[PDB]
Amino acid sequence: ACQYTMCEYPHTVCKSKGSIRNESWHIDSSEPLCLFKKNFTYNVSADWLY
Amino acid sequence: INSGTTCSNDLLYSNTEVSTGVCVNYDLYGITGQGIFKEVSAAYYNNWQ
Numbered sequence: 001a002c003q004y005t006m007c008e009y010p011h012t013v014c015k016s017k018g019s020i021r022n023e024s025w026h027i028d029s030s031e032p033l034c035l036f037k038k039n040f041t042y043n044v045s046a047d048w049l050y
Numbered sequence: 051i052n053s054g055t056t057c058s059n060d061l062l063y064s065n066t067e068v069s070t071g072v073c074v075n076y077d078l079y080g081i082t083g084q085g086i087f088k089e090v091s092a093a094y095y096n097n098w099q
């Protein structure tokens with residue numbers, strides 16, 4: 001939860017067999033003023049999440 | 051200064067001095083009160099409670 005710079009065309013690219021394009025949803029390479037940062041986990045074999 | 055998340059101490063000791071048996075003061079996890087602890091073994095809490 002920070003102050004990024006979103007794009008007019010922001011998009012994600014998967015890591016298993018990624019697409020043709022590059023993942024570029026933001027370009028903010030200057031470690032912006034963050035209010036929050038956390039890391040969580042879940043089940044890798046689950047089908048539904050909430 | 052006054053920007054970010056790297057803060058300072060600003061607070062109390064957080065001492066592991068659970069003094070059961072006597073009437074005490076507490077500010078547990080944000081909730082304040084006075085009580086008497088009486089230690090028991092229980093198994094209903096989950097790891098975010």
Ligand SMILES: *[C@@H]1O[C@H](CO)[C@@H](O[C@@H]2O[C@H](CO)[C@@H](O)[C@H](O)[C@H]2NC(C)=O)[C@H](O)[C@H]1NC(C)=O
Pocket residue numbers: 037038039
């Ligand atoms: C939370 O997990 C992510 C995922 O691993 C961490 O992001 C990685 O950070 C390292 C160090 O810069 C990079 O080499 C990896 O490429 C990152 N992974 C991804 C998927 O981008 C992140 O550092 C973790 N944060 C905490 C606080 O544990």
Ligand SMILES: *[C@@H]1O[C@H](CO)[C@@H](O)[C@H](O)[C@H]1NC(C)=O
Pocket residue numbers: 021022
């Ligand atoms: C994707 O990123 C790589 C690494 O910077 C770059 O060489 C490549 O040209 C990019 N893809 C396109 C279509 O520009």
Ligand SMILES: *[C@@H]1O[C@H](CO)[C@@H](O)[C@H](O)[C@H]1NC(C)=O
Pocket residue numbers: 043044045046047
């Ligand atoms: C949750 O993960 C465990 C081990 O990672 C696995 O045995 C179990 O099948 C998973 N459950 C679901 C619903 O995916």
Ligand SMILES: *[C@@H]1O[C@H](CO)[C@@H](O)[C@H](O)[C@H]1NC(C)=O
Pocket residue numbers: 071072073
């Ligand atoms: C009263 O004092 C005795 C010994 O000082 C102690 O064992 C007992 O728990 C006390 N009662 C209360 C309610 O604190």
